[PDB]
Amino acid sequence: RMKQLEDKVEELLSKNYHLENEVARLKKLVNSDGLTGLSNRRHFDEYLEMEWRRSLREQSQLSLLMIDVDYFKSYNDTFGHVAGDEALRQVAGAIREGCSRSSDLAARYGGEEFAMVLPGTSPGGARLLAEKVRRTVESLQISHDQPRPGSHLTVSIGVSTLVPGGGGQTFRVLIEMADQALYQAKNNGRNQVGLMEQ
Amino acid sequence: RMKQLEDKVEELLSKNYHLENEVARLKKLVNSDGLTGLSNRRHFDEYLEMEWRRSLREQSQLSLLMIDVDYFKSYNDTFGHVAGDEALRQVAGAIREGCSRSSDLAARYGGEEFAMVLPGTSPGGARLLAEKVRRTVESLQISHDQPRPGSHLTVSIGVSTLVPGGGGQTFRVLIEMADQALYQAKNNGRNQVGLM
Ligand SMILES: Nc1nc2c(ncn2[C@@H]2O[C@@H]3COP(=O)(O)O[C@H]4[C@@H](O)[C@H](n5cnc6c(=O)[nH]c(N)nc65)O[C@@H]4COP(=O)(O)O[C@H]3[C@H]2O)c(=O)[nH]1
Ligand SMILES: Nc1nc2c(ncn2[C@@H]2O[C@@H]3COP(=O)(O)O[C@H]4[C@@H](O)[C@H](n5cnc6c(=O)[nH]c(N)nc65)O[C@@H]4COP(=O)(O)O[C@H]3[C@H]2O)c(=O)[nH]1
Ligand SMILES: Nc1nc2c(ncn2[C@@H]2O[C@@H]3COP(=O)(O)O[C@H]4[C@@H](O)[C@H](n5cnc6c(=O)[nH]c(N)nc65)O[C@@H]4COP(=O)(O)O[C@H]3[C@H]2O)c(=O)[nH]1
Ligand SMILES: Nc1nc2c(ncn2[C@@H]2O[C@@H]3COP(=O)(O)O[C@H]4[C@@H](O)[C@H](n5cnc6c(=O)[nH]c(N)nc65)O[C@@H]4COP(=O)(O)O[C@H]3[C@H]2O)c(=O)[nH]1
Ligand SMILES: [Mg+2]
């Protein structure tokens, strides 16, 4: 039955290839990140652009947190990818729990990067949530040997807010500001909240 | 040997199984309706639930259109399901022309129903948009023998708007009120907008 077998291998190869293509297509149509269950980056961009227009309409404050996991590459190295993945789920959970309003959105922005969209939220309120999230990540007390061998996982967080309508500003500049602030946080020793320059 | 073909086949069975699972998992998460490209009902429910809470917070006016395709069961029976599906495709096209704000959302609510959520929108504005959808559908001139030979496909539309109150009031009251307006439109002759 060696024709029988070789034939089945061929049948299955074809069926599998179809399924792999189907998976690829569906992934581009789904809003969530497989690992963490948060919004994926595509949906983040889409959602934030839409909120940009709502805030423009209402002249409301649109806030954004850009959140990065500190020393994460070394975590994967010294604890393994599987553990890393679980650390990411735990951080995501903290981020998710960090925003409670129906209009808040938590997203996985990249490999180890997250974002929170906060419609109708003042710079002050955004700052609070940023601290709340960072603090919640710490209280998770996930073990890391970096930089000190007795340390726990942390995030750095950049904060920005804008009322849309100002010349030359877009949801993309809102991101750029939060990224700027994120840099500050990291370069001031990480595990902290950096604020945009008014 | 016959043993290398047997292992490879088992491997492929396993890969196949997991792939099929992943495809089914992802299909449940898709937010769009295949036929019309609008939001599906599950996404509509989620979106309306979130908008209700946003409107509660801002004490803003939240409007809803519930849209029935008139005599649609008869249409599908008379002209067949393929034709019916094409009619639904064209009506959806007419609808999504109907809203433009980043917060407006149109959906396939059910087999022959559509809905449109209009956050921050006054009753007057909602009626305006509803009339536009109604007019656009009729201009499609899709042939129908209902209510009589030589008619065309139309919609009846119910409009509601509420500023959410607290307590146990949920977004479902907005749907109930739009359905009541829709009933008025239908009982008044169809191919029109009912209101309240
Ligand atoms: N987007 C977003 N922002 C958040 C969230 N949590 C808090 N904030 C921000 O943090 C600021 C201060 O929050 P608070 O200390 O709880 O102080 C709050 C709280 O005591 C009360 N409050 C606001 N809304 C609610 C609510 O929905 N439920 C409850 N229990 N209290 C609320 O009013 C005070 C002032 O509220 P705000 O002026 O709006 O200002 C809030 C808001 O800008 C959140 O989950 N999502
Ligand atoms: N401590 C604190 N908690 C917050 C804040 N923002 C949101 N939350 C939490 O997130 C839940 C959902 O908020 P929502 O979707 O905006 O939905 C809210 C909002 O639509 C409205 N709401 C409640 N309190 C306030 C308020 O103080 N001001 C305004 N404008 N709306 C409120 O009622 C809905 C349900 O309220 P909750 O049962 O309290 O449930 C709130 C509350 O548990 C905040 O700033 N501070
Ligand atoms: N408060 C307020 N905000 C305004 C006004 N004009 C424009 N905007 C703001 O500017 C954005 C783009 O406006 P647009 O280019 O006219 O592009 C608009 C326009 O083409 C159309 N649109 C939405 N609502 C209306 C309306 O009420 N009347 C008309 N003629 N067009 C509208 O849909 C597009 C997207 O709307 P949005 O996503 O909401 O995004 C709108 C909204 O954030 C205004 O008179 N009042
Ligand atoms: N949800 C939703 N509602 C819509 C849309 N288009 C029109 N409306 C509704 O229809 C009402 C009258 O629209 P208008 O004659 O264009 O009269 C508008 C228009 O002249 C201007 N406007 C508002 N927003 C926009 C906008 O985004 N773009 C432009 N170009 N004009 C706008 O402000 C006037 C009054 O606006 P409203 O008080 O909001 O009242 C609006 C709003 O309730 C839409 O695409 N989505
Ligand atoms: Mg119905």
TrEMBL record, chain A:
3',3'-c-di-GMP 1 binds at R53, R57, R101, S102. Residues 60-198 form the GGDEF domain. It is found in: Cell inner membrane. 3',3'-c-di-GMP 2 binds at R57, S100, R101, D104, T121. Mg(2+) 2 binds at E113. 3',3'-c-di-GMP 3 binds at R101, S102. It comes from the Bacteria. This is diguanylate cyclase. The lineage of its organism: Bacteria, Pseudomonadati, Pseudomonadota, Gammaproteobacteria, Pseudomonadales. The chain holds residues 172 to 339 of 347 of the full protein.
